[PDB]
């Protein structure tokens, strides 16, 4: 029994407790690539918003400023981050702009079947945001009418329009020829008509296996038009643009 | 089992 | 200040090559003395900015095979060429002058696509700038596929014509001195990456106990090519890869380091850990960064390897303790330009440096000491050189160091470790021969 | 000066090592054994209940031998692990 | 450097030696006292 | 009318720093403590509790003085730590006093007891 | 430009809660041919974390040949630590828009920046006790070793 | 010790000096300094923090040997050391690279317990002082020190209910409590918690 | 809602006790029972810890 104890201990150590979480074996090294990109090609005084799980690593490997990290001493701040990550992109833009954020970093394992990506944590982010702000963020709106948590063409219209969804699944149906992608973590199929566009953020970096995706908040319009209307203006050319009629605007102040 | 979400 | 006009130029032919990431210039000059006094000196004209950006400067005779004494002097600036034997008051001389600068043309459209071709805008004086009048001149541009002019002048003579991969200019037949007024702006096509090492810290460690020489290089690389409009889209990069577009692109995907013959124990890391995409082939070390280096991006990394000491260090003939080392100054990628080089050589603890020399002029030299893994004493002798504008394959010289290392200093290192251990043992004995009982 | 030094360097014999690197691992493994033996004996002498004037003498000689050996084997082992001195 | 299988064999050998020597020590302590 | 006009001034409102007791009451309590310590010493001396009978003599005397010096010494060190001396200088002085002080104190206790 | 009220720059000694500081900025106007000192009475400086902790109107202090200089008469940093923004947003309809920002960390008090124990009258009773105890302890040790049973 | 970083929790910052257990970093820095200046071995700090835990696994093994020798005998202590050397429940959080608070804590814990046992059955004041000093070390190194703060009293309490009070118990427990309690309040992250 | 989300603060299933201690898991209760039949103060410490 003693000898068998030695053998069992050695096997358990070699198999389960001898792997770092920053490099994955297969090597898949997408964390250190995006962290070194942030460290090399971003201003030194730059604030990176992300979920708290990846706080320390950023501050330890990208050497940039964060908003939350693993030492979760203030929970309202974490709730603010998760509410920005669970709202429409306009609300998220206003929140993240108030906190002087430059970059957003998301984790997506739908291509290699990672499993510990951000979509899996979405429901938690949502629960915390719901706790602080019950009447703005509702967990029941991220399920389908039958109670399923889907991301395919049957996903709820609130899940479709969240920031995390459009920042994870952008350009993903076009990676596959024909336009039918398969999320290897969820075994659901994504169509190029499922993901709506982003009008307030711009993709600046995607790792080689698509694990880490870094977006940058775009600067506001000089004229004062909403970024949504600049986006619509770009995505639309019609001969008969509209009728003469008149704006319903209010009194000039 | 680490100090991370699940 | 202007050098006296002791010479006149029969003919002037200037050819500029733009093939690489640096500008190379060859001047074919025929000169004859116009004064009766014999003069052994000739002076070369350079603008302040060009002077600062000059890397390499040499000259020779169109007939001989050896080089003359050509030194830069330190607002037109001047280089001086010295003649071995003086000239007759009226006699012909045929010189060939070569220079390599650290400058290159900036991208004319600053932002282009991931697959679009790149064009660079380069501005140089059009008529020969010299302090000695010239009665014949010509200009040629080689190295690229297409040449155009930015805002050309009305005068037909001040214009050029195209050949195959060439662009000849006006064959003017009387130019006064100091006639650097009209400035030419050329636009050419260069579809390769423009590599720029902003800082290199090259460290060479010599060890007599192991008989090895170890090289550690820290690069800080940048790409001066056109920036990417619309930002980086990994999807577009993958669609370019799988389309098998191996066309010459202006972003760095893989670097090829040329190492000394017989290297072993290669490694490639950066500030965040160890990079696994590196592959060694005979004399060559291929390296793939974590992310492709597009126009405007940075990448700081580190390479290292080991070699046998018997290839760089020889023993003097008068005594078995005087050594002469010849160490290469650059071992890097093929087409690269350097802006600051700090080259450090580490000699063993008891070594005393006796003689030093460099094949190219350096900006500084210094000697100090630095402690290491078993340097209980003062430590390794660190000899540091500082160089400014260096080019990959034109600075191929070797630094020569002559030092002394007696057998006493060779054997003194295990002796020092032994004294440390013996002191610890005496301390243990002392601690076990006195009682603290009450 | 460059010329003369170049001529010297290019008209001299190469460097010959004192002991080849390939041999040093064996020398280290042997010297470690010798060091262990001698030092462990001098610890026995420390435990000895004999006089002080003789314990000092034996300990000092044994340590003066074990330390020489240990230094030599430290050099050899460091060179053999890839950390050149 | 050392490989993975080599480090596994080294760890297993160290364990086996340690257990055998603790068993011998216990047998001598229990028998002779 | 927002986004356009002038906004009123804002000034921070600071908290209150803790109040300190008047000096005479503290002085009275310090006098009480001083009287108490004088009481302790005189009580010891008046009773035969402390009679200074077993005073060391001969060679043991010097050991005694070394013990006394080590004891007072550490106290002095702590006092200088209380005045502003660093912690590293404190550890170094403590080591320098504690090696020979320990030797002398152990010898005294082993030879007088 | 902001600095300590005495005159010490931020880099010589970083800021700290309840410190005294001064802020100053100059304004000039273009009239087509010259740069002339701009005179305005409604420019405001703000010290914000996410909300304005301070909002102060600037007063003119010292005219130059081309620039009028406004200052915030010395004020006191809040007793809250964190990363603050010193901001001047001159946004008035009819003129150009001006924005000056500076993000600076305001630190907490260090351990050696509090008042010492001998300076608070309350601690006087507590130091005396400790001091007396230690003296009595020394006497006890001596009297213990020099007495016979 | 007075570190305030403005690169975490951006608008708020974090007072890192008084919200952190500085024992692990202090021990790593001391080992780094001692290797660099007293042995002449300038090892990279990253390598020191990477190999911190494999170095202290052996000290944990020795402390388990001593504690078990205090329980039954030396053969049982050797068995316990062999067990704790390679058991996976401890290796899971002390693998080379794991630089968390436990990498040292499980060591100090054991040492503390050892001394406490030697203090409880002999009545020594010196062993109780050593137990209190290593308890201070553990309070400064890891947040689960509270376990010990509740285990040593319980023990004593049980010995009172079983009718096994002795003067050695008074000596040991009173010395430990006084010294360790006055010493555990000097860590700024703990503060006045031992009394409130 | 936050302490509930971290994977390190969750209950344990039975296999994880055998995975982390091969056969020490059924010698541990027997060793506690054997420390009870010879009750010393040190043993009481071990029992409470257990
Ligand atoms: C953890 O993270 C979380 C999230 O990041 C942090 O939570 C934030 O904490 C902030 C405070 O530090 C807090 O901001 C305050 O909110 C208060 C409540 O605002 C709401 O209610 C009011 C109605 O009362 C609404 O109008 C408002 O829109 C909100 O809905 C405000 O009262 C605070 O305003 C005061 O401070 C700001 C700047 O400090 C001033 O601009 C403002 O005018 C107020 O200033 C008064 O008070 C300060 C002292 O607080 C005085 O110095 C000043 O002179 C003013 O005093 C006058 O007015 C008061 C009445 O207020 C009167 O008594 C006095 O006599 C004077 O006449 C401030 O805006 C964030 O909302 C909060 N965020 C969230 C999401 O919860 C949390 O702090 C972190 N934890 C840490 C760091 O430990
Ligand atoms: C107090 C009780 C302590 C008990 C022991 C504790 C811990 C040890 C247990 C496990 C550690 C495993 C370490 C794995 C090794 C990794 C590196 C490696 O794999 O080295 C191997 C080589 O090895 C060897 O040939 C070593 C041969 C013998 C070594 C000498 C004996 C060692 C004595 C130790 C103490 C010496 C001090 C003497 C003072 C008296 C790989 O070399 P390379 O190719 O990379 O070198 C670069 C290539 N050249 C070789 C050309 C340079
Ligand atoms: C007969 C022997 C007598 C000696 C007894 C020795 C030790 C007693 C045992 C415990 C006492 C605990 C209280 C002392 C704290 C001193 C720290 C200090 O020193 O930090 C102080 C202040 O920072 C602090 O409070 C923060 C608390 C520090 C936490 C402790 C660090 C963790 C290290 C754990 C141990 C690591 C082992 C070594 C590594 C292997 C700096 O003081 P300062 O340099 O400003 O000097 C000025 C002296 N003013 C202040 C009186 C004027
Ligand atoms: C006051 C307390 C003092 C305690 C010790 C006292 C006396 C003896 C002192 C030192 C004896 C030798 C220690 C060597 C440790 C450095 C090895 C290293 O660092 O290896 C790491 C990687 O691992 C290895 O390859 C070796 C793995 C096996 C290590 C076995 C260590 C056994 C001892 C554990 C505790 C050691 C002390 C802890 C603090 C360092 C260096 O990897 P790299 O990527 O940086 O360079 C790699 C070189 N390229 C860049 C050229 C490729
Ligand atoms: C007393 C203390 C100090 C000494 C030590 O701990 C206890 O006990 C040492 C052992 O002796 C270990 C060595 C075993 C042999 C093993 C051979 C491999 O040799 C390769 O090279 C060629 C060789 O012929 C071939 O190709 C292949 O056999 C193979 O690949 C080599 O990689 C690792 C090596 C040398 C072990 C390293 C660690 C050592 C030195 C251990 C120390 C830590
Ligand atoms: C006083 C001392 C002196 C004598 C000694 O100790 C007491 O008694 C010896 C034993 O004979 C030991 C060996 C047993 C066999 C065992 C095979 C393993 O090889 C594979 O065994 C498979 C099986 O299932 C796995 O599947 C694989 O994983 C695994 O690699 C190997 O790793 C270790 C090895 C060789 C033991 C090493 C130590 C030995 C030699 C011991 C000596 C040091
Ligand atoms: C360790 C035990 C034993 C030792 C002791 O107890 C604890 O700890 C001692 C302290 O060190 C106390 C002194 C602190 C300094 C303080 C200086 C004052 O004067 C200064 O005041 C400044 C501004 O007003 C001027 O700028 C300066 O120039 C001017 O010197 C003086 O009035 C009182 C004095 C000396 C304290 C007296 C009590 C002391 C000695 C205490 C002892 C009883
Ligand atoms: C048999 C007896 C003989 C006498 C004595 O006991 C045993 O042994 C003496 C020591 O030598 C002590 C001196 C040490 C040096 C120390 C320097 C101080 O300077 C500090 O001044 C502070 C502000 O006041 C600053 O804050 C600090 O930074 C700065 O270091 C000075 O003030 C006091 C001084 C001289 C100590 C006084 C007490 C002495 C004399 C001790 C006696 C009790
Ligand atoms: C029996 C034992 C127990 C009693 C004791 O040992 C023997 O003997 C005590 C003394 O009585 C000491 C106090 C004296 C008064 C002194 C007032 C100072 O305040 C000054 O403050 C300066 C700045 O403004 C002003 O310039 C000065 O005018 C002003 O006096 C203050 O710093 C320290 C303080 C209170 C001493 C504290 C320590 C005491 C109690 C000593 C104990 C150790
Ligand atoms: C028998 C048991 C039960 C009864 C009790 O214990 C004994 O007896 C009570 C006392 O009345 C205690 C309070 C007094 C006021 C004291 C103010 C401190 O404030 C400091 O806070 C620092 C920040 O770290 C600042 O820096 C300092 O300036 C500032 O003085 C605070 O920390 C502790 C506090 C509240 C005491 C502890 C709890 C109480 C109620 C104790 C109970 C648990
Ligand atoms: C904590 O939540 C946790 C720890 C370990 C494991 C686990 C593995 C983690 C990483 C692995 N690599 C990438 C090498 C492999 C793992 O394999 C395991 C095997 C078991 N067995 C044999 C039952 C148990 C755990 C691991 C996990 C996890 O399940 O992924 C989680
Ligand atoms: C990587 O190397 C580059 C090139 O030297 C560094 O860029 C310089 O950074 C300093 C400080 O931020 C600036 O003052 C210089 O202007 C930068 N130079 C260039 C050409 O950009 C960069 O800092 C290095 N990065 C790291 C992490 O070491
Ligand atoms: C050459 O030597 C050094 C280059 O390392 C420079 O001078 C020293 O620079 C260091 C760098 O901070 C200073 O600390 C020293 O004080 C400088 N002087 C000396 C004498 O060391 C400089 O580049 C050159 N020094 C010359 C030309 O005197
Ligand atoms: C500055 O001083 C006054 C304004 O206070 C006025 O004369 C003019 O603006 C300036 N004068 C000179 C001489 O520059
Ligand atoms: Mn932890």
Author numbering:
A (entry chain A): 458 to 483, 492 to 718
B (entry chain P): 2 to 7
C (entry chain E): 25 to 98, 111 to 474
D (entry chain C): 2 to 86
E (entry chain B): 1 to 33
F (entry chain F): 168 to 280
G (entry chain G): 270 to 418
H (entry chain A): 67 to 262
Give verbatim lines from the article.
A comparison with the ternary complex structure (containing Dab peptide) revealed indistinguishable peptide pose and conformation, suggesting that the Dab residue used for the ternary complex structure had not altered the conformation of OST. Conversely, binding of an acceptor peptide alone to the apo-state engages the C-terminal half of EL5 (EL5-C) only, and does not involve TM9. This still allows the subsequent binding of LLO that now engages the N-terminal half of EL5 (EL5-N) and TM9.
Oligosaccharyltransferase (OST) is the central enzyme of N-linked protein glycosylation. It catalyzes the transfer of a pre-assembled glycan, GlcNAc2Man9Glc3, from a dolichyl-pyrophosphate donor to acceptor sites in secretory proteins in the lumen of the endoplasmic reticulum. In higher metazoans and fungi, OST is a multimeric complex composed of eight subunits spatially arranged in three subcomplexes that are formed during OST assembly.
